Amino acid sequence: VKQDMPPVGGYGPIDYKRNLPRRGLSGYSMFAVGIGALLFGYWSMMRWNRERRRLQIEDFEARIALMP
Amino acid sequence: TYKYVNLREPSMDMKSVTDRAAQTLLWTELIRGLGMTLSYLFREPATINYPFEKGPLSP
Structure with missing residues (x-):
């Protein structure tokens, strides 16, 4: 018999x-x-x-009313 | 038979030029390359520990 390695029946693409x-x-x-x-x-x-x-004007009012 | 490369110009359709300009100004295909290498980040690494697993051979 022959026992090489053949391509087995064709191969998919x-x-x-x-x-x-x-x-x-x-x-x-x-x-x-x-x-x-x-x-x-x-x-x-x-x-x-x-x-x-708005908040910065409120802090300005704080420094104004504190000062004297 | 010869199947040669780069005989094509970027056509001057407005959508073609704005997509290429968006590629330029917004770095898009660069970010696609980033996504490629992150896809290889999340893979399982193909290494072998040597001194406990020696590599394969042939007879």
């Missing part, structure tokens, strides 16, 4: 080509969400600094 999923929410939508999150941070910054100026 091996993938042989590039494959790129290329996703990632192309520049329109992600550009938009970047500017939108930036605007959200701006508006919260505006509100908090106005409240902070």
